[PDB]
């Protein structure tokens, strides 16, 4: 059921297992557990030790260089909850340099309430890709798991498949198992956080992780909100006060703790807002008799004496030590060398402070984007200043964009100078607004706020250029914008025009093809584009190019990004057009959509035409030998400085000349295809070639705008009996035993007829064959024979076409005179 045993506040284990045995009689850890610095150990030393009583840890679990430990499935076989009340460098579970360790084996951990997990430098660790952290951590992107065996090598992972559930992580499913014999337990989505039983039923609402019997507060292993007398409750009822955000205690416990802290060396506990907390917040003071902090009749802030007067903030746990502070008796150095935005936690812990006795310094915060998390920061006294008498030292902030919201936020800097350097995404406008609002306008000297380093990678020209005339055509775009001139017009070096295709709308500022334009003379500047890709939406905006100036704020001019789409045109020829002759009168067409649609393909055009048979074949005697009838980029870095220097030299010479000179005295069948990539043509002559003219054409009613067609040759299949000769064979015998054979030709054969075969044989003799070609057939009206021996003969007739050889006719009997 619920937690038995004592509470065993968090402890530390070092150099031997002798002090590790004190975890046997407790199930909940009210603190942080660290097992670390274990060198004189062996793998057999751990198999004899196991702690199944442990259930959940309030703060975190840290493992650092514990030799001989291979898996945690025996040490902590019932751990399920890591609350993360106090973290270890914004990490709730750290596994660092765990040599001789192969797998985690924490097969009962379900939810980590707060924090993240960092696992690093374990050359023998596997089963890291076989675990789903999304089911446990709210923010899975905050994990940092590198330098293991799963990336430097290819160690095998064997999740039992014959049962481990598979879950998609990026785009594919894979089984989730803690070890080779422990599938990762997964609950149904209806059981969002309360957990499921063995058969998968949602537990009680006040339940978390796992439960014995569903829908029962008293049959759970981890109370989600609070624990009290073996029962999980929404809040502690009276007279019980919330304690450590995880359990409810009476007044006696808090009183005993407070008295013991007073009567010893500390967390002198008090009571406020129905909770026993160590120190009550600003404006309250604990009474003598009772422990409740009555509000004070005056402005008493909660001071936080910073040791050494200079505290470095680099992690969630380091920022948490300032929780509830209002007056900071020292200086803050904000330095998060991260890569993930910790703004939420920073605003949760900080932001309740009002004044800083010393200075504020923000250095190398790669992840910071805005200092708005200082919600209630107003005064910076600057009694202790950074070296060089500085009260706000911002340096090398890679992604800092805004300091505050000056429309609402107020600030006050008493003493000390400003400092800004290498904030590439922070613009000078914000810095000057801060100078004006704070009241430190006349305090900074030259080079205190750098100009060539701040905002160099931010597009904040704060001056608008408006396009006055934009025109679009087939493949070129004509642009025009209003002229711009700095106070010294010779400073204008021209314009930069940036264009890039934009399939979607939201496009960033500042690929991105660069073209230069000469400045105008003294007729808007304008520019004409060359060779655009038709039917495409582009992004256009003009950025000025002007000489740098050291004396003051530099200059500025740029145009807001616009979107323009070039028109449509004729599409390309359809790709891969093929034809198959499935039937004797049917042809099927297949083709692909054009590679360059150049718009929207509204329809297709298919054209049909018959090609007459080759008259050359009709005029050949194919009975001769040889009758094999056919069977059918950027810009150099030095160059730009070169033209800058040349222009500056010209300006300098002009200025010198003016100084020296002036002195101040005192038809074919077809059809229309509608969104079909294939076609079937009917009503075609058998075994006849057809040429297919195929067009992809994207405009029908307002005239066709579409290019040339694809030409292919398709020949229909031949009829089976087209070459079969119809009509009885007629034989004629003259006085001199001269035989002439007559028959009716196949008037509609597969294409044409080249020759005929006549085979005449006497009864019992050998078969004699004869060929009659087209010219012979026309001249003799069939077959003519000379000098026949007496007897009974059988004559067989067949035809030859382009398809092949025709069937023979029924033999006919005839006999000649013997004289």
């Amino acid at each position: 059921h619920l937690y038995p045993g004592e509470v065993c506040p968090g402890m530390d284990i070092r150099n031997n297992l002798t002090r590790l045995h004190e975890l046997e009689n407790c199930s909940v850890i009210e603190g942080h557990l660290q097992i670390l610095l274990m060198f004189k150990t062996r793998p057999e030393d751990f198999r004899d030790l196991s702690f199944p009583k442990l259930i959940m840890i309030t703060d975190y679990l840290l493992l650092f260089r514990v030799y001989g430990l291979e898996s945690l499935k025996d040490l902590f076989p019932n751990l399920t909850v890591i609350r993360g009340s106090r973290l270890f460098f914004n990490y709730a579970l750290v596994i660092f340099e765990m040599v001789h360790l192969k797998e985690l084996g924490l097969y009962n951990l379900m939810n980590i309430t707060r924090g993240s997990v960092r696992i690093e430098k374990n050359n023998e660790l596997c089963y890291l890709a076989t675990i789903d952290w999304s089911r446990i951590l709210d923010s899975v992107e905050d994990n940092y798991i590198v330098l293991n065996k799963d990336d430097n090598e290819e160690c095998g992972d064997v999740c039992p498949g014959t049962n481990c559930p598979a879950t998609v992580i990026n785009g594919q499913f894979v089984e989730r198992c803690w070890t080779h014999s422990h599938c990762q337990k997964v609950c149904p989505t209806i059981c969002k956080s309360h957990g499921c039983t063995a058969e998968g039923l949602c537990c009680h609402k006040e339940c978390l992780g796992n439960c014995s019997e569903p829908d029962d507060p008293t049959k759970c292993v981890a109370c989600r909100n609070f624990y009290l007398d073996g029962q999980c409750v929404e809040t502690c009822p009276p007279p019980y006060y919330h304690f450590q955000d995880w359990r409810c205690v009476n007044f006696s416990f808090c009183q005993d703790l407070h008295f013991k802290c007073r009567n010893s060396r500390c967390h002198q506990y008090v009571i406020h807002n129905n909770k026993c907390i160590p120190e009550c917040p600003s404006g309250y003071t604990m009474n003598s008799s009772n422990l409740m902090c009555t509000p004070c009749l005056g402005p008493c802030p909660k001071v936080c004496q910073i040791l050494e007067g200079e505290k470095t903030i680099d992690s969630v746990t380091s920022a948490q030590e300032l929780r509830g502070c209002t007056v900071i008796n020292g200086s803050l150095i904000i330095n998060i060398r991260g890569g993930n935005n910790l703004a939420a936690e920073l605003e949760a812990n900080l932001g309740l402070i009002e004044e800083i006795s010393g200075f504020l310094k923000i250095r190398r915060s790669y992840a910071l984007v805005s200092l708005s998390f200082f919600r209630k920061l107003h005064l910076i006294r600057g009694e202790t200043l950074e070296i060089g008498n500085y009260s706000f030292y911002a340096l090398d902030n890679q992604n800092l964009r805004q300091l505050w919201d000056w429309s609402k936020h107020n600030l006050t800097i008493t003493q000390g100078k400003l400092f800004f350097h290498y904030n590439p995404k922070l613009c000078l406008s914000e810095i000057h607004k801060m100078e004006e609002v704070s009241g430190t306008k006349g305090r900074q000297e030259r080079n205190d706020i750098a100009l060539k380093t701040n905002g160099d990678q931010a597009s904040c020209e704060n001056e608008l250029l408006k396009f006055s005339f934009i025109r679009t055509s087939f493949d070129k775009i004509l642009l025009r914008w209003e002229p711009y001139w700095p106070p010294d017009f010779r400073d204008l070096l021209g314009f930069m025009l940036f264009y890039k295709e934009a399939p979607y709308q939201n496009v960033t500022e500042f690929s991105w093809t660069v073209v230069d334009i000469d400045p105008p003379q003294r007729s808007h500047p304008g520019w004409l584009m060359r060779g655009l890709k038709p039917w495409t939406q582009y992004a256009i905006f003009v950025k000025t190019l002007v000489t740098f100036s050291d004396e003051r704020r530099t200059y500025g001019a740029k145009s807001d990004i616009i979107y323009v789409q070039t028109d449509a045109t004729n599409p390309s020829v359809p790709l891969d057009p093929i034809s198959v002759s499935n039937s004797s009168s049917q042809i099927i067409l297949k083709w692909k959509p054009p590679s360059d649609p150049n718009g929207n393909i509204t329809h297709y055009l298919v054209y049909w035409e018959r090609q007459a048979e080759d008259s050359e074949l009709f005029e050949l005697d194919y009975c001769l030998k040889g009758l094999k009838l056919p069977s059918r980029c950027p810009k150099t870095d030095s160059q730009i400085l070169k033209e800058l220097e040349e222009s500056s030299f010209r300006k300098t010479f002009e200025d010198y000349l003016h100084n020296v000179v002036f002195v101040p005295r005192p038809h074919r069948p077809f059809e229309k295809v509608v969104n079909k990539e294939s076609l079937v043509i009917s009503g075609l002559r058998h075994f006849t070639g057809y040429r297919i003219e195929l067009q992809a054409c994207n405009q029908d009613s307002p005239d066709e705008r579409c290019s040339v067609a694809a030409y292919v040759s398709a020949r229909t299949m031949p009829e089976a009996k087209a070459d079969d000769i119809v009509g009885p064979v007629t034989h004629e015998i003259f006085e001199n035993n001269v035989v002439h054979l007559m028959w009716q030709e196949p008037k509609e054969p597969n294409g044409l007829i080249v020759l005929y075969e006549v085979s005449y044989r006497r009864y019992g003799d050998e078969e004699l064959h004869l060929c009659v070609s087209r010219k012979h057939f026309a001249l003799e009206r069939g077959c003519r024979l000379r000098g026949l021996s007496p007897g009974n003969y059988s004559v067989r007739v067949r035809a030859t076409s382009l398809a092949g050889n025709g069937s023979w006719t029924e033999p006919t009997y005839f006999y000649v005179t013997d004289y």
Binding site: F489, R490, K651, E654, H658, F662, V663
Partner: peptide
């Protein structure tokens, strides 16, 4: 008219403001 005059524009500015008397040059 009060505006920044540089180079050539300064030249015609001087030519408009004076030129009936001639530009001064110290002896």
């Amino acid at each position: 008219v009060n505006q920044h005059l540089c180079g050539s524009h300064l030249v015609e500015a001087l030519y408009r403001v004076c030129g009936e008397r001639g530009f001064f040059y110290t002896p």
